Amino acid sequence: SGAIYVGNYRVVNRHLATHNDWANLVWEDSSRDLLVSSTTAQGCDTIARCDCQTGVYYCSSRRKHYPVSFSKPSLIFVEASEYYPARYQSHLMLAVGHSEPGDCGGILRCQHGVVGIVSTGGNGLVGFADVRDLLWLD
Numbered sequence: 489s490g491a492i493y494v495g496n497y498r499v500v501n502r503h504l505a506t507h508n509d510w511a512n513l514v515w516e517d518s519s520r521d522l523l524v525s526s527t528t529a530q531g532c533d534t535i536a537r538c539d540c541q542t543g544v545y546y547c548s549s550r551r552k553h554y555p556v557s558f559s560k561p562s563l564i565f566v567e568a569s570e571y572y573p574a575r576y577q578s579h580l581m582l583a584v585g586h587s588e589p590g591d592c593g594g595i596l597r598c599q600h601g602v603v604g605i606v607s608t609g610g611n612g613l614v615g616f617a618d619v620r621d622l623l624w625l626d
């Protein structure tokens with residue numbers, strides 16, 4: 489689980505959004521696994537405006553931060569897991585790293601701030617939903 493809090497926006501995995509997230513929907517994209525909802529309280533997170541392909545992500549299933557190399561955002565076919573079926577996902581970044589069910593909403597970040605959140609795992613890979621193209625967030 490986990491979210492980004494920037495200005496008056498909460499960014500979450502679409503498949504983990506709550507009834508409140510949908511009651512305060514700003515934007516959602518089923519192809520990206522993203523949803524943004526409005527918050528009343530100001531968030532502290534800064535979104536990276538960069539094309540970094542290295543950073544650190546938080547892995548709650550190991551309670552560790554891992555440094556990773558990741559691919560640039562692209563359309564990727566996502567393998568079926570124990571709990572979710574297989575599907576295509578846009579704006580997805582892969583790295584070699586640990587991600588299992590529960591790890592979603594872990595934040596990937598670089599010097600310039602938040603790059604994305606964990607969205608996929610399996611097969612010794614972690615997939616991250618990029619948020620850097622969403623300039624309206626900052």
Ligand SMILES: CCS(=O)(=O)N1CCC(C(=O)O)CC1
Binds near residue numbers: 489504589
């Ligand atoms: C590990 C691949 S997955 O498709 O099973 N999946 C990713 C993490 C998600 C979450 O923690 O919400 C749900 C589970």
Ligand SMILES: CCS(=O)(=O)N1CCC(C(=O)O)CC1
Binds near residue numbers: 542598599600601
């Ligand atoms: C790249 C991983 S990071 O985002 O956790 N971190 C390292 C880059 C910054 C620096 O070392 O100048 C500080 C922030």
Ligand SMILES: [Zn+2]
Binds near residue numbers: 536540598599600601
């Ligand atoms: Zn960066």
